[PDB]
Amino acid sequence: GRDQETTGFAWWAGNARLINLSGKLLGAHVAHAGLIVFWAGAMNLFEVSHFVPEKPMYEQGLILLPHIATLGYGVGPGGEVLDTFPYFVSGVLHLISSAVLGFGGVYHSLIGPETLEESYPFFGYVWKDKNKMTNILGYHLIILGCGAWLLVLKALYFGGVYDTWAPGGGDVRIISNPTTNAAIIFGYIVKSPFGGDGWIVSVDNLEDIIGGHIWIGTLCILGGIWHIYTTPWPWARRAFVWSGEAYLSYSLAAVSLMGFTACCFAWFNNTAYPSEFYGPTGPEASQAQAFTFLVRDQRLGANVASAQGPTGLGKYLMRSPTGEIIFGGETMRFWDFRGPWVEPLRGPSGLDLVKLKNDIQPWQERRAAEYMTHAPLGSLNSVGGVATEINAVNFVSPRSWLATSHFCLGFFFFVGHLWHAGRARAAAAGFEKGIDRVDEPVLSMRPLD
Amino acid sequence: LTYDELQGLTYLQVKGTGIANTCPVVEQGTSNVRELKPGDYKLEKFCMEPTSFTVKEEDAKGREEFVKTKLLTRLTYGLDGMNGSMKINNDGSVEFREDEGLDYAATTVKLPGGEYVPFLFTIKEFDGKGTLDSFSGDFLVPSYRGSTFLDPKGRGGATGYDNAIALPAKADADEIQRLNNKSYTPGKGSAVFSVAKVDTETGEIAGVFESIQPSDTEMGAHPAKDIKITGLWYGQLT
Amino acid sequence: LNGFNFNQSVVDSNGRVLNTWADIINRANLGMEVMHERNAHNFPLDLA
Amino acid sequence: LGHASFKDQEGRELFVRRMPTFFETFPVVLIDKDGVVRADVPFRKAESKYSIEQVGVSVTFYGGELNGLTFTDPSTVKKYARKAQLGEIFEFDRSTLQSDGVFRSSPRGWFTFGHLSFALLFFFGHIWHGSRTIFRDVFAGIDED
Amino acid sequence: SLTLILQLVALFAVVAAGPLVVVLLSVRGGNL
Amino acid sequence: MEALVYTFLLIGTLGIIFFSIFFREPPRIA
Amino acid sequence: KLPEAYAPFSPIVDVLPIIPVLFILLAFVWQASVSFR
Amino acid sequence: MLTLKIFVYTVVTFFVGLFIFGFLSNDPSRNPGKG
Amino acid sequence: LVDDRMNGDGTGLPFGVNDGILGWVIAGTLGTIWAIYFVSQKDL
Amino acid sequence: AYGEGANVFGRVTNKSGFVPYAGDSFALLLPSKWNPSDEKEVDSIVLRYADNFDAVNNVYVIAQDTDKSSIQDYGSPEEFISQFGYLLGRQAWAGQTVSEGGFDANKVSSAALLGVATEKDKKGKTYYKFEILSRTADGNEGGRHQLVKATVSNGKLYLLKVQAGDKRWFKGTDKECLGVLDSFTVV
Amino acid sequence: VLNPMWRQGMFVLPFLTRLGVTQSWGGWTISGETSSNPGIWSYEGAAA
Amino acid sequence: SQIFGVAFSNKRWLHFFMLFVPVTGLWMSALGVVGLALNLRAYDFVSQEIRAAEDPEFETFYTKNILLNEGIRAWMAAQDQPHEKLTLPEEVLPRGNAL
Numbered sequence A: 001g002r003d004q005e006t007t008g009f010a011w012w013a014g015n016a017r018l019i020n021l022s023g024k025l026l027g028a029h030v031a032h033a034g035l036i037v038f039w040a041g042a043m044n045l046f047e048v049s050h051f052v053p054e055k056p057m058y059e060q061g062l063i064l065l066p067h068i069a070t071l072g073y074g075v076g077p078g079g080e081v082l083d084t085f086p087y088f089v090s091g092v093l094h095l096i097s098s099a100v101l102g103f104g105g106v107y108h109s110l111i112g113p114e115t116l117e118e119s120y121p122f123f124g125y126v127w128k129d130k131n132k133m134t135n136i137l138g139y140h141l142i143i144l145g146c147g148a149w150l151l152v153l154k155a156l157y158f159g160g161v162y163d164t165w166a167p168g169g170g171d172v173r174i175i176s177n178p179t180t181n182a183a184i185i186f187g188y189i190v191k192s193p194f195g196g197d198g199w200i201v202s203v204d205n206l207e208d209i210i211g212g213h214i215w216i217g218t219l220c221i222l223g224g225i226w227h228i229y230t231t232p233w234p235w236a237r238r239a240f241v242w243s244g245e246a247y248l249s250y251s252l253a254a255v256s257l258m259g260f261t262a263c264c265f266a267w268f269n270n271t272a273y274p275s276e277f278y279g280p281t282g283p284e285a286s287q288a289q290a291f292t293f294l295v296r297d298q299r300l301g302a303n304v305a306s307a308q309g310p311t312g313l314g315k316y317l318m319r320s321p322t323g324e325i326i327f328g329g330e331t332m333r334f335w336d337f338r339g340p341w342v343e344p345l346r347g348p349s350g351l352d353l354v355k356l357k358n359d360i361q362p363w364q365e366r367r368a369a370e371y372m373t374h375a376p377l378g379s380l381n382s383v384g385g386v387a388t389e390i391n392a393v394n395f396v397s398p399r400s401w402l403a404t405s406h407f408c409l410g411f412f413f414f415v416g417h418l419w420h421a422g423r424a425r426a427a428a429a430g431f432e433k434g435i436d437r438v439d440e441p442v443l444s445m446r447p448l449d
Numbered sequence B: 001l002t003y004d005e006l007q008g009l010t011y012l013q014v015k016g017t018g019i020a021n022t023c024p025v026v027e028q029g030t031s032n033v034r035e036l037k038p039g040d041y042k043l044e045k046f047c048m049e050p051t052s053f054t055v056k057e058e059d060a061k062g063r064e065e066f067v068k069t070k071l072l073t074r075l076t077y078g079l080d081g082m083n084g085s086m087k088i089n090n091d092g093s094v095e096f097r098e099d100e101g102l103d104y105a106a107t108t109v110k111l112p113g114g115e116y117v118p119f120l121f122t123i124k125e126f127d128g129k130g131t132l133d134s135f136s137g138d139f140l141v142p143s144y145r146g147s148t149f150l151d152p153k154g155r156g157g158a159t160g161y162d163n164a165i166a167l168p169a170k171a172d173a174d175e176i177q178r179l180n181n182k183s184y185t186p187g188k189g190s191a192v193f194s195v196a197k198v199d200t201e202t203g204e205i206a207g208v209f210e211s212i213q214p215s216d217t218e219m220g221a222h223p224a225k226d227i228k229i230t231g232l233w234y235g236q237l238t
Numbered sequence C: 001l002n003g004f005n006f007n008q009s010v011v012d013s014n015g016r017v018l019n020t021w022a023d024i025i026n027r028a029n030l031g032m033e034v035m036h037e038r039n040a041h042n043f044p045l046d047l048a
Numbered sequence D: 001l002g003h004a005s006f007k008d009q010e011g012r013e014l015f016v017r018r019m020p021t022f023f024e025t026f027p028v029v030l031i032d033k034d035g036v037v038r039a040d041v042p043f044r045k046a047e048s049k050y051s052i053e054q055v056g057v058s059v060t061f062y063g064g065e066l067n068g069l070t071f072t073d074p075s076t077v078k079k080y081a082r083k084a085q086l087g088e089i090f091e092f093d094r095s096t097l098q099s100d101g102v103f104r105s106s107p108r109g110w111f112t113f114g115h116l117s118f119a120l121l122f123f124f125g126h127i128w129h130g131s132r133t134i135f136r137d138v139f140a141g142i143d144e145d
Numbered sequence E: 001s002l003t004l005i006l007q008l009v010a011l012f013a014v015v016a017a018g019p020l021v022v023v024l025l026s027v028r029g030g031n032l
Numbered sequence F: 001m002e003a004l005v006y007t008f009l010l011i012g013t014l015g016i017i018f019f020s021i022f023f024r025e026p027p028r029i030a
Numbered sequence G: 001k002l003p004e005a006y007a008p009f010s011p012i013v014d015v016l017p018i019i020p021v022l023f024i025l026l027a028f029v030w031q032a033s034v035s036f037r
Numbered sequence H: 001m002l003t004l005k006i007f008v009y010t011v012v013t014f015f016v017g018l019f020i021f022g023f024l025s026n027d028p029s030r031n032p033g034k035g
Numbered sequence I: 001l002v003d004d005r006m007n008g009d010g011t012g013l014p015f016g017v018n019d020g021i022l023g024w025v026i027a028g029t030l031g032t033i034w035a036i037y038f039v040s041q042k043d044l
Numbered sequence J: 001a002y003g004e005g006a007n008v009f010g011r012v013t014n015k016s017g018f019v020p021y022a023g024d025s026f027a028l029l030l031p032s033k034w035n036p037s038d039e040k041e042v043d044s045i046v047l048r049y050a051d052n053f054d055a056v057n058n059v060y061v062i063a064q065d066t067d068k069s070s071i072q073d074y075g076s077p078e079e080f081i082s083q084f085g086y087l088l089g090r091q092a093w094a095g096q097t098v099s100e101g102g103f104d105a106n107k108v109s110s111a112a113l114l115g116v117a118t119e120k121d122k123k124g125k126t127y128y129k130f131e132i133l134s135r136t137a138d139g140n141e142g143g144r145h146q147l148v149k150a151t152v153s154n155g156k157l158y159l160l161k162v163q164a165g166d167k168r169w170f171k172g173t174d175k176e177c178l179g180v181l182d183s184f185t186v187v
Numbered sequence K: 001v002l003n004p005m006w007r008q009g010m011f012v013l014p015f016l017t018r019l020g021v022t023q024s025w026g027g028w029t030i031s032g033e034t035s036s037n038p039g040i041w042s043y044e045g046a047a048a
Numbered sequence L: 001s002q003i004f005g006v007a008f009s010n011k012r013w014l015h016f017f018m019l020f021v022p023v024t025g026l027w028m029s030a031l032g033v034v035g036l037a038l039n040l041r042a043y044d045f046v047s048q049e050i051r052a053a054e055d056p057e058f059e060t061f062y063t064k065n066i067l068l069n070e071g072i073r074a075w076m077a078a079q080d081q082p083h084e085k086l087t088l089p090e091e092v093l094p095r096g097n098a099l
């Protein structure tokens, strides 16, 4: 590497020393990609080795085995695991690919070309070359469009993706006729983010999921070709700061928005994150508590429709803010919860009193593991449910884990976006190091009063 | 909307639109009313939604008037899913008798002047005697709160403090209305119904009602006002 | 995600619960728990 | 009013547990000579064998205004037990001064509070003044030396 | 347990691998 | 009065901070 | 669990997640070795 | 009550449009520094 | 019902609009600001 | 105190979570987590243990001097538990209420029978076993599970009564409550 | 009727009442009648 | 001055304020703990408690805090102060609904 006396950056800012070094920058990127794939393979092998087959895939602290299981690799009808060989194959393939990527990153970091323009003009790039940066962005956009179309191919032709909304409690269901309706997809993307709708966490079916993926893959490929064959317009030139730090800040803001968004998928979505693999969401186990106590107390003999609580609102059933019949407990906030074990019990007006009395299914009754433990409580050092629970059961929800972690890292990346956006603006302006001390701007301004 | 096209809608279409709080109507029926076949009936899905909430407050000068009010609680006031019997005779005498369902709804309404009036809109345990043109009766009105309800100071009925815990020198014969009584004795209300727009082919009646019932006495501290509830009701005869 | 839960972490050779400052904090926490929303709960386990 | 003495239904003298100073309010319990809880004014009033109306305790009184007035049936027993958790039961006139209901502090407590607060404030004052009198040359100026 | 013994030896092999690389580059020349 | 005194004190504090922001002494020496 | 041909390598697998945590600390070792120049 | 929503939507759209087009209108050149 | 309500809470309304007038005033306000900026850009 | 070395490489002496107790012609495995408490609700209680976490989870046995020779002479087990509808706790509230929800008129508590048995252990004397779900109008702990194992050996009725809130019962205290239930053997 | 404003030493309330304001924000009216909507012009509204 | 409205103009006053604020805060808290040493606590608001005593409708967050403090005391004293020997049964301890 280099020292501070030449680069001007200290050791705790050493990665800035390779801002203008294309080959070393590429080597750092490839080594980091090797790190990501190494974590994927190693953590996959760890979760496979620490997998007990009789338990569901959430009492064991497994977060990414559900990610493979959602694709339909080794998943039975009801949600059983059948075999762990696809998970093992994924882990081993990731480990070997990470070995290759780590070798390439180490090579380009240590003995690769220091700067790429003098020998490899296709890969050489200056940060002020807008056409070259849009070319690289177009290559990556086409790659991401192919990646989304890969999931589309898996859903459509390779007999995959697990549907929770399939009758009987879900099944690995090959998806036919995905909804490619532009009105539906963009009404998903432009709607309110609050409780009534949810902006992006509202997908209740794999048909809309795969239609949106078709749209995003086609758009990404087309935008990649567009960026390959265009140059940014003068309004974009006047609006953006064209430097490697500013581009990083743009990526940081976008990826922090993605981190918050993924935290919200993890907490609320039960379609792209099946309950059989990720445990209950926030709204369920709370809806399940009211549902199971309703069916238990009507199994004893007491009617649930005409039973009122201490406040006179209904111990089991009440009305929502809109006239829908919902569960009468404190779970009136979670009345928007849609689950595979609720919808056949639910009708047009409300919760279908007659269906609650007669048309309850034994599998919906057996789905009380949702309620029993596994409500997304759990404490930091494991232990059971609420903070006042005793050391009885070893469980924290995977949804809780990868929602909390993802919100933390999303907020940190928003902070990093702020830092890098400010420093990029100060670098383009010329005062990243401070004030010139002989002509400061303040002395050229009139005093406020 | 009639019952035929309400069942033709999905849950997501009705959700958030206010349709689920509306009782069904009859469009293909007849207004003859008396054409209904006599016999013993077991009606189900007895619907009952209101159209106005008027509260009787008595001025201190001696005349009787009701006033229109503003609702504070959103669309939780309808009655749905009830069932019972109607012994209709050939002349027109009925034996309407509600048994079980969502036969209550806790409703809070605001009087002019800014005073909150909570009440429990019930039709539970109601018997109906009269002709098809008009039949009335009485229904049971519960308290509003159960005996396990605690006040802001923790005092209550079945469970609670029954004592001014805030201050150890005030439990004399002035807080008896607030501490010692804690009454939850049910009241009764009178409702009058009317049958209009009868249906012959599938036995679907949808008339109007006017109900009188006491308001909430909170915990027995102050006397209850009278709430007049008018609206539409709906039923299917089998 | 909550805080540390060290309730009944200290047990003796026979398995009896030895009390702890964390256990005293737990008693205060559950005393707070039974007071919160005295009328807003219909079911035992507080999830919503 | 006298010494409120409580007896069980079969007959044994219960005692109301007195309130400590830390408690703004205290549960009303009546426990045995041996030290076992025998009755209370329960909060839940739907369980066990300790509510007053089913244990059947009676308060007798042996003092000035109440010397042989025994109360056994109504909630006056619970009221006298709650008054007995505060010590000896006394009759109070709360209409002459329009009394509050909450307990006030003694002149002893007010004197102690004022003097401890003044004592810490004067500890700070002494520290500041000792600082100022040891460091007079630097509190005024050392003149570039 | 022998499983724990192999876990410890693999842990020591992977923990000591990095500092071994650093000390080997320190004693076998430079360019780091 | 009870609420009137609280409102008067709050708007007095708000008026004080408004005067401090706008009708302050102009800053001198740095 | 791992397949039967990979069961003896599961104890080796049990250590593999912590290597990325070891990598940033390796970077700190290298900075210490170059004396934080 | 619908007109309140219309007025608020107009106000919010106005302020958001001012925000977006003001940041479009040569914001990186609004500096005292030489560059 | 006892009152008139907007009944627009939920149902996934695009940008929250339930009538065409809201979308039209949004588009008109954005277009007016864009027109002012466009005819008045580049300082001069 | 006497000097002895610390426990290193000496394993653990208790993992079953049950400690034996031998009393006056009765024996039972108490939960190891639970601790004794001197709170005699009924005067016939001779032993009482309660959970350190939540004292609703409690167990006690009564030694009531009795006349009937064997537990079968108490009639049907239903007739027996009708006699013992006093150690559940009668309601201290007498006001009128039809607003509790899912309860009889003017009532704030209910008990539902879920088990009736005549189990035997070693000698031939039968053990009346019962499970009762007690639902109180407030809904505390979601109800309480009363498991009763009663018999008479010489002339004294021995009745186990372990209590468990429905909140804790669903978490997994069922194993310990049933362990006490099956371990109550009157010798 | 029996404890009117002039028996309570009210000085500016008769002058407020004389020109139209009768009900307050507390939901009462000096005439003993049931209070309709006071609007912004109640006693306390005029004072504010 | 253009962000907050007010700003420091003297380093003397800036650093004296930085010294002054935590010392004054800690001294006020010390005086409060001295007041608590004799149980001279600002526990209640008499007007609020009388209002809520004569009104079953009047509730504030302060009343909620008072109710929470009662539960802290009742459920904490038995295991907190072993000298007091508080063998209080569970029914006299206060509870809400269902928890």
Ligand code: CLA
Pocket: A001, A002, A003, A010, A011, A012, A013, A014, A015, A016, A017, A018, A021, A024, A025, A027, A028, A029, A031, A032, A099, A102, A103, A106, A108, A109, A110, E021, E025, E031, E032, G024, G026, G027, G028, G030, G031
């Ligand atoms: C994602 C982590 C990461 C990555 C990929 C990099 C990558 C890089 N850093 Mg960097 N760094 C990091 C974190 C990282 N850093 C952190 C956290 C700090 C703060 C402590 C620094 C501080 C820092 C400084 C001060 C400098 C760098 C520099 C460099 C570049 C060249 C290093 C060099 O030339 O000297 C050689 C380094 C070594 C010989 C030791 C590394 C040994 C190898 C490469 C890795 C360990 C073995 C590995 C397992 C081999 C894999 C085997 C394979 C077959 C799979 C390089 C591209 C230099 C630079 O900016 O270039 C101008 C520079 O001076 N970094």
Ligand code: CLA
Pocket: A025, A026, A029, A030, A033, A101, A122, A123, A124, A125, A136, A138, A139, A140, A142, A143, A144, A146, A147, A148, A150
């Ligand atoms: C046309 C040229 C080209 C192509 C195809 C790529 C492709 C890629 N680059 Mg790269 N790059 C390029 C030019 C190109 N780059 C240039 C000129 C530079 C400047 C030196 C860079 C600098 C650069 C950096 C710094 C990094 C990359 C990285 C990556 C990878 C990111 C995708 C990923 O890992 O996520 C997952 C992949 C998917 C979701 C795709 C799924 C697989 C599909 C099915 C294959 C697509 C096949 C498709 C038909 C072929 C594409 C056609 C092509 C003309 C675009 C990816 C494979 C990153 C990396 O190192 O990753 C290892 C990274 O850090 N590139």
Ligand code: CLA
Pocket: A011, A012, A013, A014, A015, A016, A248, A252, A408, A409, A412, A413, A414, A415, A416, A417, A419, A423
């Ligand atoms: C993919 C995102 C990304 C990228 C590529 C960069 C890249 C860069 N950053 Mg940056 N940064 C980011 C995100 C990113 N940052 C975020 C999210 C934050 C907010 C936390 C920051 C805050 C930040 C600051 C304050 C600075 C940089 C700096 C730099 C430059 C030198 C980095 C270096 O060598 O430091 C060396 C790296 C280390 C010493 C290791 C960091 C150790 C961290 C602080 C402890 C946490 C690690 C621990 C394992 C995680 C715990 C859990 C976590 C959730 C808290 C470099 C170009 C420097 C700069 O401005 O140069 C121009 C600098 O001053 N960054």
Ligand code: CLA
Pocket: D106, D107, D110, D111, D112, D114, D115
């Ligand atoms: C340390 C000296 C001291 C002590 C121990 C006492 C003690 C006592 N005094 Mg006394 N008093 C004192 C000095 C003292 N006084 C002085 C110097 C004066 C002259 C002003 C008085 C005048 C006086 C009168 C007229 C009365 C008493 C009364 C009483 C008794 C009632 C309790 C009480 O004081 O109310 C409560 C005490 C407090 C609430 C202390 C206030 C706590 C801090 C210091 C307030 C903070 C000030 C704050 C920043 C200002 C903003 C508030 C603003 C919004 C209004 C009590 C035993 C009463 C009595 O019983 O009649 C005989 C009585 O009416 N005192």
Ligand code: CLA
Pocket: D121, D122, D123, D124, D125, D126, D128, D132
């Ligand atoms: C008998 C004790 C005593 C005496 C004789 C002094 C004397 C003096 N002090 Mg000192 N001080 C004391 C106690 C005392 N102090 C205590 C207890 C504290 C801690 C709170 C301090 C903290 C203190 C500081 C920080 C400073 C002094 C300063 C000074 C010097 C002059 C400044 C001045 O008073 O202007 C006039 C003071 C005022 C106009 C104060 C306004 C009135 C206050 C806010 C309210 C008064 C309350 C009430 C009316 C009186 C009742 C209090 C009584 C019951 C104790 C002076 C020689 C200053 C110095 O060092 O000199 C350069 C200085 O800055 N003192």
Ligand SMILES: CCCCCCCCCCCCCCCC(=O)OC[C@H](COP(=O)(O)OC[C@@H](O)CO)OC(=O)CCCCCCCCCCCCCCC
Pocket: F010, F013, F014, F017, F020, F021, F025, L003, L004, L005, L006, L007, L008, L009, L010, L013
């Ligand atoms: C849109 C803008 C958003 C900001 C608007 C809100 C900011 C409010 C302005 C701060 C208060 C002004 C302080 C006056 C005091 C004042 O003006 O002193 C003036 C002082 C300037 O001091 P100098 O530097 O001039 O000191 C040297 C002098 O000794 C010689 O002149 O300001 C400061 O001390 C620094 C800022 C401290 C500000 C402390 C904040 C206090 C919080 C106030 C909270 C009020 C209660 C809540 C409301 C009910």
Ligand SMILES: CCCCCCCCCCCCCCCCCC(=O)OC[C@H](CO)OC(=O)CCCCCCCCCCCCCCCCC
Pocket: A190, A235, H024, I014, I015, I023, I024, I027, I028, I030, I031, I032, I034, I038
């Ligand atoms: C209800 C459905 C909800 C979803 C639909 C949402 C659609 C959002 C489409 C916005 C995309 C516009 C990107 C421009 C970004 C800034 C370009 C610029 O810096 O622009 C500046 C740039 C500088 O040269 O100029 C230019 O290149 C000119 C290019 C800008 C294009 C102008 C937009 C068309 C103008 C139409 C006028 C609307 C008029 C008023 C209508 C009244 C109806 C009653």
Ligand SMILES: CC1=C(/C=C/C(C)=C/C=C/C(C)=C/C=C/C=C(C)/C=C/C=C(C)/C=C/C2=C(C)CCCC2(C)C)C(C)(C)CCC1
Pocket: A028, A031, A032, A034, A035, A038, A092, A095, A096, A098, A099, A100, A101, A102, A103, A105, A106, A109, G006, G009, G010, G012, G013, G023, G024, G026, G027, G030
């Ligand atoms: C540049 C640089 C850096 C970075 C580095 C890196 C990042 C590296 C890497 C690398 C990597 C990224 C690596 C990876 C890897 C991998 C591997 C090496 C592998 C493998 C293989 C094997 C051998 C396996 C086996 C197996 C199987 C197959 C299954 C079963 C189990 C087992 C495990 C046995 C640092 C920071 C230091 C500093 C600065 C400079």
Ligand SMILES: CC1=C(/C=C/C(C)=C/C=C/C(C)=C/C=C/C=C(C)/C=C/C=C(C)/C=C/C2=C(C)CCCC2(C)C)C(C)(C)CCC1
Pocket: A185, A186, A188, A189, A200, A203, A208, A209, A210, A211, A212, A213, A215, A216, A239, A240, H019, H020, H021, H023, H024
């Ligand atoms: C796949 C999927 C899907 C789909 C999705 C989508 C389709 C999405 C999208 C989206 C989109 C379509 C987006 C867009 C965007 C854009 C953005 C986000 C932007 C931006 C930017 C900014 C922020 C700016 C700034 C500025 C201004 C303001 C002006 C001046 C300049 C500047 C730069 C400063 C669904 C859900 C269906 C299903 C499931 C899955």
Ligand code: OEX
Pocket: A330, C036, C037, C040, C046, C047, C048
């Ligand atoms: O609301 Mn307030 O708060 Ca969250 O927990 Mn469940 O619900 Mn209620 O409880 Mn505790």
Ligand SMILES: [Cl-]
Pocket: A329, A330, A331, C040, C041, C042, C043
């Ligand atoms: Cl609840």
Ligand SMILES: [Cl-]
Pocket: C035, C036, C037, C038, L064
């Ligand atoms: Cl609360």
Ligand code: NA
Pocket: C036, C037, C038, C039, C040, C041, L095, L096, L097, L098, L099
């Ligand atoms: Na409660």
